[PDB]
């Protein structure tokens, strides 16, 4: 069916930015602990909390 | 009149000036002679903190858990 409103429509230049979700998703139940304080390590690269 | 010059207390006795460094030995001795009533009026406690315990004569050494050797060189401590 026809849309009751007419749509603004046309080509436009878009950039893909460096921030993707697959580089940011991170979850941790249990894993490595810090040697001094016996607390979880820091950062998703180290499976941190 | 007592001032501090770095980590040491220098006393200038008004001339009865005599400037000299107060040895921690004599400060400890004069702290140990303070009566219980005197230093309990100064805020100290007879059981948990006497003034003469502010002078260090025996250092407690923490166990290795306090100061661990986190060797990351995979061979060198």
How many Å lie between the alpha carbon of A39 and the closest alpha carbon of chain B? 14
* Residue in A closest to B66 by C-alpha: A36
Run of H or E including B4: strand B2-5
Residues of chain A in contact with residue B67, where contact means CB-CB under 8 angstroms, are: none
Q: Which residues contact A41 (CB under 8 A, 6 or more apart)?
A: A31, A32, A33, A34, A47, A48, A49
Q: Using alpha carbons only, give the angle B70, B75, B77 rounded to the nearest 5 degrees.
A: 40
DSSP for A30-41, please give it.
Answer: S--B-TTT--B-
Residue matched to tokens 């849309």: A3
In angstroms and rounded to an integer, the radius of gyration of the C-alpha atoms of chain B is 20
What residues in chain A have their Cβ under 8 A from chain B's Cβ atoms? 35-36
Residues of chain B with Cβ-Cβ distance to A36 below 8 Å are 68, 70
């Amino acid at each position: 069916k026809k849309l009751m409103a007419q749509i603004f429509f046309g080509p436009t230049y878009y950039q893909r930015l460096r921030h993707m979700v697959d580089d940011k998703i991170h979850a941790r139940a249990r894993g490595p602990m810090q040697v001094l304080t016996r607390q979880p390590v820091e950062g998703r690269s180290r499976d941190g909390g | 009149t007592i001032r501090k010059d770095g980590l040491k207390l220098v006393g200038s006795w008004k001339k009865d000036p005599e400037l000299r460094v107060l040895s921690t030995e004599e400060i400890l001795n004069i702290f140990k002679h303070i009566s219980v009533k005197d230093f309990t009026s100064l805020g100290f406690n007879e059981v948990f903190s006497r003034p003469e315990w502010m002078i260090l004569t025996c250092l407690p050494v923490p166990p290795p858990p306090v100061r661990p050797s986190i060797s990351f060189n995979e061979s060198q401590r």
